[PDB]
């Protein structure tokens, strides 16, 4: 066993031309992960309450009570872009390919290596680090996907997305049903209002564990594992945003007049009245054909609550929402259309060399133009009879409940069967790449965290954990914890991501958004005299593409 | 952090601030991830109108709800998350030695938890600024028209194309089985009397 | 209803998909979506305008 | 040899249906055994006197004196119940079937490990532990039953029920022909009675030695030990429960007269009397047939003495008895139709994070209806001639011998040719699986602490040592002890257990017993905060079944 | 219809006999029937 | 009856063998009638009745 070397490393990005324009991309992540001795060989149950934040009587959002069974267990996550594709090779996609197909996945484990600390008390101390070459390490696979699913992307807890740095998997969590009941309460809101967890449903209590549930393999240093090729089931990815509203929809107005001569002043005037109009309106009562009027064959995308924070029996949580943008530029309602915030540190994104232990982030505001501006509406009558009166529009300004701060675009839903929708873009790095889908009759028409949901299969979960390493003293008839010999393991895993795309042709005249390397950017993709580096987000979908 | 011995008041703190913490959440305003704010893939059921008696050219009619439960145990909206309601008497049920005519009944309380609390719920304004200020913040207390009873939990409809949902369970005996379906082009995804 | 939303483009009104709803000449011409027509001559319309 | 891994792990529990309702479950235990070095190389011949509890003139039921042989072999048992299924198997079995039949099992031993421990007294001292790859493990296997049969259940040094939690063989040993003699003695009897250890009777020497009557296997870490599968010989076991006792068979009485309205007080009267009434009796003096005269078929269970211990070569000992229920709820004899007693701690379960050294344990009370309520007999007169008289009757309450405590229920013995029998049903988790059977020419109809007696052929004992590892100096003619390198191994046990049984349909229109969720046991099958594992014994036998 | 196996180390809700449901289930002196309304989906599965 | 199959599948088949009683129809013709409760409907708070 002992010798000989169990794998090979390729982190590699190769891009294969067929026929008829399509690509077949295979991107490879082997990436060098080391990992600790569990503190706990035993499974937890823990409670956590911070009933001192959502007591102020102002604080609701921050509700930070759940209930998580940890487990001895170590996570492996790559569910993720950053990890596969680096800055260089997403430009060649982005600004190439139309639109995406996710195809196969395929993880491998090698040169397992295990190491066994001796403290060695004498001055210093000093400590002596030796091979336990009969170690093991116990690797599982959820194949059969019979666990939870956390994708670790959410909370940053992925892999490393600098190949050459050695990254982390993560300690394995998972949730257990928590009973509560929380009422709002503003900070006037007299009294005590009402908070508590009861505990929990005893129908709703699933106790997951690993070593009952899947096979696991021992995997001496002469060992290797690998996960065959799972094939995903995904309806593609399109690289292209639609910029088009509900006034960019039709055969315009026909311009009776046009100008004569430039200015950014001489505007076309049509030349007929607006109570004189020919064509089609979704109106009995009027006479008057505007842009704003006339009838579209639909509407794109809807409104809906802002920040309209249900709750259920598990605790109240936030709406989601599929929104892109809906205003002029730093003209937006970063919270309206639901625009993605992403906090990362030090190992998926972020300079390096940095200091101190505080998040970096930004708010990916994509290209497509589907969201809103909630400031620009309004209900009235059927009785229509403009110039409008007060007693006769509702309007943003205008306060719902008596209330200032509120609008009736703040409770406003307009999600008819006649709603058009564009899925949620990929946001690179960072960002999620698949998802598992919910197990309900009914299911979620697109995921805001990922672009690719798989329905009839996923590949399962990979589990890395820390065989015990026990010494000459050990009483299974003590409580005392397993006092075992302080071991740690490193080894190397590769991945192979499996992307099968089509190439962008020109229509157009006026050349298409595309991304590049400014006086502005230069720096942010390249180390620097200590090694610093750092991997920005940027947009995916960068290019036109005609809705109708 | 984790308790280092028993009991139901030792709480694992997590050890991180809520404007300090790694993570994704659907806002561009805040800092704050919380379990209220995080993201999540998508959203479980959905929130409509209560007592939303519409009416067309045959009649008012009530607005039907596919609910399952939403709150602690004989803590429920009853009417909100839509539990059925059955009447039979002597031949379906009810002691077959009784007097008079009056029918018994039972309303159904699933065990599925896609139902809601809409007495834990608000709108609240983009600015976040919390600890959020009255004129900022539209509870379920907080009249709506003027009138007491009413609510915008009342008048609220959060259905989205992201609304996930589980179709109405058999409530044996009494209950329906198979139902037709509706000759309309478009068709309702689950129907409220039969699996 | 007259839901006139907006976007990055300007205000517009929701559409709907309705059919009747009331007592004949008893209707909300706006709530169910009544469609308009606007035509001349060439469409319709007495040709001896 | 070295690098490189032996076997897998799998604690998963498979279930496959067949047809004509027939499922082949396969439980999977892989456990990993710790074992230490054996204290002595020699076999010991030991004698227990406990000669100061047997002399308080009250105390003869506390007999600890026999004679065991230690030797150095540590055994390895797995003959359990609670070491197979966990909480939440044994509902599926035991909720849907009908009966079970006990197949297939088989052993397997891999990933072995032997480390040595140096103490480097320095400061602390401190202690360095290593591996001594070339160091062995004697694996024997007694596949020819030539040992005595020792049963490590009885004693709860069983195995881990926990997969997740490294367990420990049991130091073997077996019984010496130890003579004896013990003469009652209550608080009062006069004198000092009698009662001495002779010795042994030189016919009844039997001396065994594991390395002189069975092949002995060295493993080595490169090395690997498999069983092959073994097949039982057993009758099925039933997972149903008699209700029925003799005022509970055949045609009940025809009541000529029944209630005309509700209340728990309106009871049906046959209306004919009991000197006149038509049907058949066991009985040629009376003419009285009531429910508890007329002629049953036979009987059910027996009525035998209770606390009658016995005695004979080898010292006094209880009499066991094949026992149900026999009463209301709450409302047993514990002892007369003789229910189990239970005590095990720490690692077969009882609460993980207790303190101090007390067993904990549960009286298993069946759901059968076989036993007796010994409180409600009578032995009368063949004159009959009732209302029965004092002189006439011998009762319960009337003592027997002239001692009050006694009675003839104490001293009574009702067994015929006509006792109905239902066998011992499981007890988990502690409880027994299979136990070999007696080699007599007559044999007991069934065992007391296992429902699976396998007759002409059973699987081995699975004898585990550790091989001397020696120093430096040697004198086999010196006794001292042959001062060995401080060492010890671990090892990784798998274990597949076959069973194959039947589903239960529905017969009745009243649901049955089954087993559930409460909002009282939710806390009793999940860790806790620290980590709090534990496993209660639940009713295996919960669902009616017609005796006739 | 397809049978459920086991997942969970926890036992799920079942349905049951109590000494409250005993009468809810059999005739009386007189033949009082009757049918109980019982909960249908009891038993856990995982969403996500 | 319950006939369980390959890889955890049965076939149940329930049978419901009822004696039904029927009286002869009051009118051998078909009516149609209208149902006016405007005397609960009038109350100015009952209109779900």
């Not at 090779?89 to 195809?103: C, F, G, K, P, R």
């Not at 508590?196 to 709703?204: E, K, L, N, R, S």
């Not at 992403?342 to 969201?371: L, N, V």
Request: glycine letters at 6%.
């Amino acid at each position: 066993g002992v010798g000989i070397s169990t794998g090979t490393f390729n982190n590699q990005t190769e891009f294969k031309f067929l026929e008829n324009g399509w690509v077949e991309i295979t991107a490879n992540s082997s990436r060098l992960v080391h990992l600790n001795m569990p503190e706990s060989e035993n499974y937890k149950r823990v409670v956590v309450n911070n009933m001192d934040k959502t007591a102020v009587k102002g604080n609701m959002a921050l509700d930070d009570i759940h209930v998580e069974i940890v487990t001895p267990w170590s996570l492996v996550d790559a569910n993720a872009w950053g990890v596969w594709f680096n800055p260089g090779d997403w430009q060649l996609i982005v600004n190439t390919m139309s639109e995406l197909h996710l195809v196969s996945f395929e993880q491998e484990i090698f040169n397992v290596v295990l190491k066994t600390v001796s403290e060695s008390a004498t001055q210093p101390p000093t400590k002596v680090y030796n091979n336990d070459l009969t170690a093991s390490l116990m690797v599982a696979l959820d194949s059969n996907n019979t666990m939870p699913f956390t994708p670790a992307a959410m909370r940053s807890e992925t892999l490393g997305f600098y190949p050459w740095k050695p990254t982390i998997p993560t300690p394995w969590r998972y949730y257990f049903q928590w009973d509560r009941t929380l009422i709002p309460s503003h900070t006037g809101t007299s009294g005590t209002p009402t908070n508590v967890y009861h505990g929990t449903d005893p129908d709703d209590v699933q106790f997951y564990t690993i070593e009952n549930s899947v096979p696991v393999h021992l995997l001496r240093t002469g060992d290797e594992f690998a996960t065959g090729t799972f094939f995903f089931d995904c309806k593609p990815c399109r690289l292209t945003h639609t910029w088009q509203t509900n006034r960019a929809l039709g055969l315009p107005p026909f311009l009776n007049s046009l100008p004569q001569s430039e200015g950014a002043t001489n505007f076309g005037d049509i030349g007929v009245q607006q109570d004189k109009r020919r064509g089609v309106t979704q109106m009995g009562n009027t006479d008057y054909i505007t842009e704003a009027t006339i009838m579209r064959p639909a509407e794109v995308g809807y409104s809906a609550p802002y920040y309209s924070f249900e709750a259920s029996t598990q605790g109240p949580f936030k709406t989601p929402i599929a929104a892109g943008r809906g205003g002029a530029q730093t003209d937006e309602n970063q919270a309206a259309d639901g625009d993605p915030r992403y906090a990362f540190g030090r190992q998926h994104g972020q300079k390096t060399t940095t200091t101190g232990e505080t998040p970096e982030r930004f708010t990916y505001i994509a290209h497509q133009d589907t969201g809103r501006y909630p400031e620009g509406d309004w209900i009235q009558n059927i009785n229509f009879n403009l110039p409008v009166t007060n007693d006769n529009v509702l309007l943003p300004t205008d306060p719902i409940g008596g209330k200032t701060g509120i609008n009736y675009t703040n409770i406003f839903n307009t999600y008819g069967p006649l709603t058009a929708l564009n899925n949620v873009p990929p946001v690179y790095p960072n960002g999620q790449i698949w998802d598992k889908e919910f197990d309900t009759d009914l299911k979620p028409r697109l995921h805001i965290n990922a672009p690719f949901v798989c329905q009839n299969n996923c590949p399962g979960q990979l589990f890395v954990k820390v065989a015990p390493n026990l010494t000459n003293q050990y009483d299974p008839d003590a409580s005392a914890n397993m006092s075992r010999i302080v071991t740690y393991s490193d080894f190397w895993w590769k991945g192979k991501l499996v992307f099968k795309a089509k190439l962008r042709a020109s229509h157009t005249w006026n050349p298409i958004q595309q991304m590049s390397i400014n006086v502005d950017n230069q720096f942010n993709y390249v180390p620097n005299n200590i090694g610093a580096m750092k991997i920005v987000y940027e947009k995916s979908q960068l290019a036109p593409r005609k809705l109708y």
